[PDB]
DNA sequence: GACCACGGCGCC
DNA sequence: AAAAGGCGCCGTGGTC
């Protein structure tokens, strides 16, 4: 490309270098443009940023988020990622991509500018006539991004102190806990390793070795394992509580105090929107879709998380939401009725399982009844429910039956739905996503079987993420409006912060467009809280 | 100091 | 662990 000075002309497409992956947290170490045939090379990266009037090419949104965290407003555009990955959600990275569409994903940003050009010029080509795929780019993935770079350079706000002091009261227990395991193994190991526990239990206490590992074919020191070896020895109770301490410690209330941003005073995620195979979102550097809320002491973490002096937080979570997309999918007659009735599937499971009243079935009993709903719906098998619920395996495979017979075009959708994946090489959400899924007529068994629950589910949880996603890009210029936040996206809910002042009116709207953002044979429902922290804006 | 694989486990 | 699906992060263990 021939050499022009900097700046571009509009609509040039951007390459850009950051000192590490995070971008709240990069140096900007290079940028460039590309377009008519030129390239060009920004002297100094961050005033050069303020001639872009939009963030077009690989990776926009990282630059976005960037520019906004300088106090720049420059939206990301176009974006030869989120082309791909609608062509093939396999299409995870800038590396594969460039490989695959006609190029190389180097470290230099001119050449990542030239080669954002170029794939976007392919890309665009491989869409042309695929309408629904395009649909999904302009009027769902691509405002997503501008939303997405939004909430990752807002952030949430952390009691920093709540959690430094929970650590050393934390600290005590686990002591307490190691110190009993040690004396009950007759010696001290590290505990750990799952490696040197294994020898431990299963050599020196003798105690029945109950599974194995996947990939080394190990002796299983899983939660699951070491359940069904509770009342085989004291020191199996010791070891469970000594994992929660140490899983909750290690992951979120140590770490997460050392990564308050200095200009910001908060938190800041990363919102990726080409990582799954299905559409969903996933967040990392921290993870906050993934902050604990079913233990007292997760419970203790999640009010760490906190709305800003003179705000509050809004919790807006789909109710029963993939149950609902498969009545709207399948067409299942009394699946409907269900959801038109008003009934609730995860409290009359709940009810069932502890054998309690359903106005009794309080919320760590309905959240056991998810996993069971889930479980068995996406194909769990007879023997690992009768175990996950301490009954029969004949009453486990009852259980199973009658759901299913409950509900008959279920099945039916199921079939369906492979036979048209194993003719086409994918399946499809509502709006036309699609997962390539090759080894439905793989000839070994359980590795079809395996690709026939992914293929099954991926319509199902990829269309509840299209919702949501459709729900997020109409709502936030709402919220713009009325001078309130978007925080964090959790897969069906969503966290908002708005003024004191103005929260209940913003709780009310926010619930009316999730629930009418794209309308099934089911009416979608929102339970919405507001309180000072995210467990309390649930409750 | 960086990789990766693995088992394990937090959430949806 | 076992015919749930989708993620990302932890510590260990091995390696470079
Ligand atoms: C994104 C949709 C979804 C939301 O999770 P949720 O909000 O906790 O539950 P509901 O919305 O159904 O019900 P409500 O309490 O009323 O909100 O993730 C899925 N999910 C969840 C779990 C726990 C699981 O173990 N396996 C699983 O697949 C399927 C589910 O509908
Ligand atoms: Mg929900
Ligand atoms: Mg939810």
Redesign the pocket.
Same mark, same amino acid.
């Given at each position: 490309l021939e050499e022009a000075p900097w700046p571009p002309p509009e609509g040039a497409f951007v390459g850009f270098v950051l000192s590490r992956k995070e971008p709240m947290w990069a140096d900007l170490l290079a940028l460039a443009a590309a377009r008519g045939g030129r390239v060009h090379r920004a002297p100094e990266p961050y005033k050069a940023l303020r001639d872009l009037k939009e963030a077009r090419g690989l990776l926009a949104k990282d630059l976005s988020v960037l520019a906004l965290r300088e106090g720049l407003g420059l939206p990301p555009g176009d974006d030869p990622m989120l082309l791909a990955y609608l062509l093939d959600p396999s299409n995870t990275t800038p590396e594969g991509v460039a490989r695959r569409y006609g190029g190389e994903w180097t470290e230099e940003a001119g050449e990542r500018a030239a080669l954002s050009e170029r794939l976007f010029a392919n890309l665009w080509g491989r869409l042309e006539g695929e309408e629904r795929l395009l649909w999904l780019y302009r009027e769902v993935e691509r405002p997503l991004s501008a939303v997405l770079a939004h909430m990752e350079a807002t952030g949430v706000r952390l009691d920093v102190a709540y959690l430094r002091a929970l650590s050393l009261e934390v600290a005590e227990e686990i002591a307490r806990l190691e110190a009993e395991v040690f004396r009950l193994a007759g010696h001290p190991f590290?505990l750990?390793?799952?490696?040197?526990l294994?020898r431990v239990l299963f050599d020196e206490l003798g105690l029945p070795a109950?599974?194995?590992?996947?990939? !080394?074919?190990?002796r *299983?020191? +899983?939660?699951?394992?070491?359940?069904?070896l509770r009342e085989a020895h004291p020191i199996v109770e010791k070891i469970l509580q000594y994992?929660?301490l140490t899983?909750?410690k290690?992951?979120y209330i140590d770490?997460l105090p050392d990564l308050i941003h200095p200009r910001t005073g908060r938190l800041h995620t990363r919102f990726?929107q080409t990582?799954?195979? !299905?559409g969903?979102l *996933?967040? +990392?550097?921290?993870?906050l879709?993934?902050?604990?809320?079913?233990?007292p002491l997760?419970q203790r973490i999640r009010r760490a998380f906190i709305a800003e002096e003179g705000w509050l937080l809004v919790a807006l979570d789909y109710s029963q939401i993939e149950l609902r997309v498969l009545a709207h999918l399948s067409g299942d007659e009394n699946l409907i009725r269900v959801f038109q009735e008003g009934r609730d599937i995860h409290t009359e499971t709940a009810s069932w399982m502890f054998g309690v009243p359903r106005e009794a079935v309080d919320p760590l009993m309905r959240?056991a009844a998810k996993?069971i709903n889930?479980?068995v719906?996406?194909?769990?098998?007879?023997?690992?429910l009768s175990?996950?619920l301490a009954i029969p395996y004949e009453e486990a495979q009852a259980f199973i039956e009658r759901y299913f017979q409950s509900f008959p075009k279920v099945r039916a959708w199921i079939e369906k739905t492979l036979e048209e994946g194993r003719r086409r090489g994918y399946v499809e959400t509502l709006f036309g996503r699609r997962r390539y899924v090759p080894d439905l007529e793989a000839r070994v068994k359980?590795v079809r079987?395996?690709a026939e629950?992914?293929a099954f589910?991926?319509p199902v949880?990829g269309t509840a993420a299209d919702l949501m996603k459709l729900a997020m890009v109409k709502l936030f210029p709402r919220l713009e409006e009325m001078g309130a936040r978007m925080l964090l996206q959790?897969?069906?809910?969503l966290v908002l912060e708005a003024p004191k002042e103005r929260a209940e009116a913003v709780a009310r709207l926010a619930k009316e467009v999730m629930e009418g953002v794209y309308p099934l044979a089911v009416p979608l429902e929102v339970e919405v809280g507001i309180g000072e922290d995210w467990l309390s804006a649930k409750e």
């Open positions: 590290n750990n390793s799952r490696d040197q294994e109950i599974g194995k590992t996947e990939k !080394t074919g190990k *299983s020191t +899983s939660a699951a394992v070491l359940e069904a994992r929660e899983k909750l290690s992951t770490p990726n990582a799954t195979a !299905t969903r *996933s967040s +990392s550097d921290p993870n879709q993934n902050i604990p809320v079913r233990t997760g959240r996993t889930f479980g719906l996406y194909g769990m098998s007879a023997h690992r175990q996950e359980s079987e395996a629950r992914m589910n991926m949880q959790v897969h069906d809910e």
